[PDB]
Design a protein around this ligand. Structure first.
Ligand SMILES: [Ca+2]
Ligand SMILES: [Ca+2]
Ligand SMILES: [Ca+2]
Ligand SMILES: [Ca+2]
Lengths: 403, 181
């Protein structure tokens, strides 16, 4: 399985609707071997990109397009055999009306009835000025720009699960990506995952890595990946829940610039989440926050193919970013890499065997079928066993396949 | 008043006539706040974070948004202005304010004169809030001009140092009582 993020921070501005534009990309997306497409938040939102949702049921108000266009897009993907996952933004919500205090805290679901029609009682206790102090305290981090939803309130859970089931049954989404998952407890996420029964689910849990006095990440990042593993275990290690592997992304960001030794932990295992629980980690090079037009934690631009050579051949579930595939002229190289992974049966739990990890060389063998090399090291032929032919090579990367 | 007070590491409330170091709640995230040039600019200085955990940085002065003094206590969810109580080579105001321009496509909180004042003039308005619904005394800072935006620090050394700005992950802070200056 390989994920594809089908939008960037600028998609909402697209002339003629993003859903419409994406229709012309489905043949290419399906042909590359992509199994799941992550679509942007679909509902009405004060912020154009959709991360400040108001009327959860109002899909027609989205900058990406309307409900009809969304359904056709998902229909085309399903026909092609690819699943669609929705970006679920439920830590916070924006209110439709002002209450007596003149505070925007009266919500509206987007239907003529009372579905999702909450008030300041559903807002987390201490989230000032929005809250009326009657709700329960936040189960996780607060999101500063908007009212945090009190997920301990039973009507909240009930009506949200009902919306999730609607997204699935009516719209046709197959799974979820939980935005700002650190905003509520694993217990809370468990309720939604269990009651909506998605086929796939991935949470966004982003916390700082551990740093040294030099201003760069520490060699060991166990505290960081432990936090991701702890969440998965709480929601259900046997279910469909996974987490984005921010540990690997943070390490690869700097390893790629002449410090490839960072890619081998003391135990000879991968340093990120994939080194402990690959089945539950989804790897990536950049997303709409880290890269795109936000630049929160960009991968060195000239070395992105090294990032793709790593995640596309390694354990865990890789996620390809829109821009890199279509806008950067990397499509052919990326295509080839997914093909190598697909033909050899490499999956989220493939065995990783790190052969070398020098400053200028990272050499690893996976499932005894594929060997990947990152780095400028010119000749490494002496290190690659017999019965291995070059399958792909590019700027500071090469991959060999057996037979 | 209504909002609970902000507490320092010794459990006492924050006073508007005292200096405090703004440290990371988890030392793995680095040391205290300070000022540093970067991104090609010599001045004004950006609000930076010292990567070294043992470094307390520069003491800060937190003040109720201009016309709000009362009991000298600093409370949560309330407009506040912040200044580094330190001397700089730029010889400019050492008060914080959100930048109107992007540096490397990122919005940072800087120091010195407000280049392009908004009609509201709220570039220098900040707020201290609890990071989560937990009882622990761990906070986060927000820039509140038009809307409130949580602040985090760019730790990738782009521009020459770690800088405070509008970005994830939000920086979870703790306040240590600093000596008078
Ligand atoms: Ca309604
Ligand atoms: Ca909030
Ligand atoms: Ca976010
Ligand atoms: Ca929350």
């Amino acid at each position: 399985q390989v994920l594809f993020q089908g939008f960037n921070w600028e998609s909402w501005k697209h002339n003629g609707g993003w859903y419409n534009f994406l229709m012309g990309k489905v043949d290419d997306i399906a042909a590359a071997g992509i199994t799941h497409v992550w679509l942007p938040p679909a509902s009405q939102s004060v912020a154009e990109q959709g991360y400040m949702p108001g009327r959860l049921y109002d899909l027609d108000a989205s900058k990406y397009g309307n409900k009809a266009q969304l359904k056709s897009l998902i229909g085309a993907l399903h026909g092609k055999g690819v699943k669609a996952i929705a970006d679920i933004v439920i830590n916070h919500r924006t209110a439709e009306h002002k209450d007596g205090r003149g505070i925007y805290c009266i919500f509206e679901g987007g239907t003529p009835d009372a579905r999702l029609d909450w008030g300041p009682h559903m807002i987390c206790r201490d989230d000032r000025p929005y809250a009326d102090g009657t709700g329960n305290p936040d189960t996780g981090a607060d999101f500063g720009a908007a009212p945090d939803i009190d997920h301990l309130n039973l009507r909240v859970q009930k009506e949200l699960v009902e919306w999730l089931n609607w997204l699935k049954a009516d719209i046709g989404f197959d799974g979820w990506r939980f935005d700002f998952a650190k905003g509520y407890s694993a217990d809370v996420a468990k309720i939604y995952i269990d009651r909506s029964e998605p086929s796939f689910a991935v949470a966004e849990i982003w916390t700082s890595l551990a740093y040294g006095g030099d201003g760069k990440p520490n060699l060991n990042q166990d505290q960081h990946r432990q936090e991701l593993v702890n969440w998965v275990d709480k929601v259900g290690g046997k279910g469909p829940a996974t987490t984005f592997d921010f540990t690997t992304k943070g390490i690869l960001n700097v390893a790629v610039e002449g410090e490839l030794w960072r890619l081998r932990g003391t135990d000879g295992k991968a340093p990120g989440m994939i080194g402990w629980w690959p089945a539950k980690a989804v790897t990536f090079v950049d997303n709409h926050d880290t890269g795109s037009t936000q630049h929160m934690w960009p991968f060195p631009s000239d070395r992105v193919m090294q990032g793709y050579a790593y995640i596309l051949t390694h354990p865990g579930t890789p996620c390809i970013f829109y821009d890199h595939f279509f806008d950067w002229g990397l499509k052919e190289e990326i295509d080839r890499l997914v093909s190598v992974r697909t033909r050899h049966g490499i999956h989220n739990e493939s065995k990783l065997q790190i052969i070398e990890a020098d400053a200028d060389l990272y050499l690893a063998e996976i499932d005894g079928k594929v060997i990947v090399k990152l780095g400028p090291r010119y000749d490494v032929g002496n290190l690659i066993p017999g019965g291995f032919k070059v399958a792909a090579h590019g700027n500071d990367y090469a991959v060999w396949e057996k037979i | 008043a209504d909002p609970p007070p902000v507490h320092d590491t010794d459990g006492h409330e924050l006073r508007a006539d005292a200096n405090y170091y703004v440290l990371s709640a988890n030392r793995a995230h680095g040391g205290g706040l300070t000022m540093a040039p970067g991104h090609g600019r010599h001045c004004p200085l950006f609000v930076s974070q010292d990567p070294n955990g043992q470094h307390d940085g520069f003491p800060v002065r937190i003040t109720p948004y201009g016309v709000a003094p009362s009991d000298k206590i600093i409370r949560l969810s309330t407009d506040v202005r912040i200044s580094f109580r330190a001397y700089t080579t730029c010889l400019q105001s050492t008060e914080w304010h959100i930048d109107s321009e992007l540096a490397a496509g990122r919005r940072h909180v800087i120091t010195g004169p407000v280049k392009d004042p908004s009609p509201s003039g709220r570039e220098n308005a900040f707020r201290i809030e609890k990071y989560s619904g937990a009882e622990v005394h761990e906070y986060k800072l927000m820039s509140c001009g038009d809307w409130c935006q949580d602040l985090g620090v760019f730790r990738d050394l782009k521009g020459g140092a770690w800088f405070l700005g509008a970005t994830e992950p939000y920086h979870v802070v703790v306040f240590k009582k600093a000596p008078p200056a």
